[PDB]
Design a protein around this ligand. Structure first.
Ligand SMILES: O=C(COc1ccccc1P(=O)(O)O)NCc1ccccc1
Ligand SMILES: O=C(COc1ccccc1P(=O)(O)O)NCc1ccccc1
Ligand SMILES: [Mg+2]
Ligand SMILES: [Mg+2]
Ligand SMILES: [Mg+2]
Ligand SMILES: [Mg+2]
Ligand SMILES: [Mg+2]
Ligand SMILES: [Mg+2]
Lengths: 236, 236
């Protein structure tokens, strides 16, 4: 552990500085170090962890998509062969992406999830587990892919079950979970009808609970409701 | 050398793929490997080297500026102390930036510059040498800073002398060199009058040579002339 000699609070402070500097690889390493101190994470600290790795893996996913599309064009009728380079480099990026996902999943399994007893922390971590298996699924091929997809589905489902019992329908954690599980259904599981039904039921049940919220909470919830509606517009 | 086992042509191909994927750290490592094969670089290959390291160091400069400004606020009248973290992290980024600059300068010195006999390659490499000493100067403090500034000035000046003898006034390499040397004068050397005079003389002498150019070359030259005029507007 390269961050083993740095104070937990210093790691959190530096993660925040790295976010400001848009240094997301540094931010992720600092938050990994904070997690490995072994104490539970606060709401703010959980969000820092999520922001850091979402940005890192997002860059890798974008690059992998560019490279995979070049690779697929290179393996089409009428292409003159270029040799192994495109495949090799896509494999390099893919391997780096898988390693980031494995790192996050390792943090959740050792030992964030098992110590998370409150609904807000447990749903948050289980949503993350679903997300990073979903990113693994995006680059997986074969039976391989089926066990990874089922791991994503299981994590999302446990998170959904808890959120429906323990959180109101406008809770932003609950809404963001349903948003991402709906994307899983549409993009990974080949279940567009399940995706649309989940996004619609989630939107409608939040709409009916908005009257209970303050102005600030209303803004938080309607923001994510708009993302659900954007997807339904794209999907229907 | 981690790229010692990869073919030169494969390194160039992968640099181009990395550019497409906006993976500039990879692009720079691939081009470093290509340079270390020991053969001279073509015009296209020189541009790939420059693009890669400009993007890498640009990210570091942007982050260093964010962190240094936070550090300066933290050391002002009325700030409550936060401890060593801001300084430590700015120093980390600074050290990483200096290492990238040192790497580029090492490639130029071993042995790109000494083998560059044509005006287009020699001016290109000497401009690069001025640029990466200028980036070192931006974070340097003290006497330290004076020797680094003089190294930047010397490189830019040798490049200017060659470009004035060997290239027409609209040559994009010559124009980009004059642009960057003018920025050196304004931002590093505390010589705004020298900056303005150089940018104005460079613009006016290119304007008078535009009639000699094709439509495509006219577009290339006027693009950089606009950058010179943008700076003069900012500076006067
Ligand atoms: O189509 C997508 C999906 O985005 C969404 C949308 C809604 C919820 C979650 C995600 P997700 O957790 O990010 O998938 N693209 C995102 C992307 C892809 C490549 C690089 C960077 C970002
Ligand atoms: O003020 C500048 C100077 O830009 C110019 C302008 C004209 C010529 C060269 C440069 P330069 O070789 O890039 O300095 N900002 C650039 C920057 C700073 C931080 C991060 C990324 C980019
Ligand atoms: Mg301690
Ligand atoms: Mg693979
Ligand atoms: Mg249902
Ligand atoms: Mg060979
Ligand atoms: Mg220093
Ligand atoms: Mg003069």
């Amino acid at each position: 552990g390269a961050m083993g000699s740095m104070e937990r609070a210093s790691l959190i402070q530096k993660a925040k500085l790295a976010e400001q500097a848009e240094r997301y690889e540094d931010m992720a390493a600092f938050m990994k170090g904070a997690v490995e101190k072994g104490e539970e994470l606060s709401c703010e600290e959980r969000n820092l962890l999520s922001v850091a790795y979402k940005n890192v893996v997002g860059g890798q996913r974008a690059a992998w998509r560019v490279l995979s599309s070049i690779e697929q064009k290179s393996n089409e009728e009428g292409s003159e062969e270029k040799g192994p380079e495109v495949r090799e480099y896509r494999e390099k990026v893919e391997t780096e992406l898988q390693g980031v996902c494995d790192t996050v999943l390792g943090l959740l399994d050792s030992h964030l999830i098992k110590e998370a007893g409150d609904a807000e922390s447990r749903v948050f971590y289980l949503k993350m587990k679903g997300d990073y298996y979903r990113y693994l699924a995006e680059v997986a091929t074969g039976d391989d892919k089926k066990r990874i997809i089922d791991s994503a589905r299981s994590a999302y489902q446990e998170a959904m079950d808890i959120s429906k019992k323990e959180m109101p329908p406008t809770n932003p954690i609950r809404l963001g979970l349903a948003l991402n599980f709906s994307v899983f259904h549409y993009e990974i599981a080949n279940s567009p009808e399940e995706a649309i039904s989940l996004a619609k039921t989630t939107f409608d049940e939040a709409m009916a609970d908005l009257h209970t919220l303050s102005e600030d909470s209303y803004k938080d919830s309607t923001l994510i409701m708009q993302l659900l509606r954007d997807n339904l517009t794209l999907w229907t």
